[PDB]
Amino acid sequence: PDAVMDFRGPDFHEPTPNMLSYLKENCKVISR
């Protein structure tokens, strides 16, 4: 009890990126 889950631990998926951040990173959406 009062343990806080380490979502970066070895039994979690890699952190899901922000959808806009991901689309921008993949050069699918543009800012200017």
């Binding site: 970066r8 990126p17 951040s21 990173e25």
Partner: protein, 114 residues
């Protein structure tokens, strides 16, 4: 931009020779993990936390001994999880640690021995 999920940087043995020969401003931590090794799942998380906590004040890097096994042997590594703390002053002897040392022992070494 999406910010990369990992800070501890994997190096080849030659990129490490370059990084040790060149002048350094900060302690260099070299992790000789291997991907089949159980304790290395834990050491990789401790080193990721160290790499966040020190930001640019430490250079924490890792060397997969599946790839650089002969270099690990020449580094006198006798097991995994192993870690070198290489001072930025090139006169000082580096510190090899063996086993899952506490993250507080890593901080102790980096602040007081490097």
């Amino acid at each position: 931009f999406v910010r990369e999920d990992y800070l501890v940087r994997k190096l080849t043995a030659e990129e490490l020779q370059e990084l040790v020969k060149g002048e350094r401003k900060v302690p260099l931590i070299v992790d000789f993990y291997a991907t089949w090794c159980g304790p290395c799942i834990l050491m990789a998380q401790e080193l990721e936390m160290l790499a966040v906590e020190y930001e640019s004040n430490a250079m924490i890097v890792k060397v997969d001994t599946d790839d650089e096994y002969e270099f690990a042997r020449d580094m006198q590594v006798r097991g995994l999880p192993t870690l070198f703390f290489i001072s930025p002053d090139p006169s000082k002897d580096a510190i090899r640690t063996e086993g899952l040392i506490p993250l507080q022992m890593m901080r102790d070494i980096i602040d007081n021995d490097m």
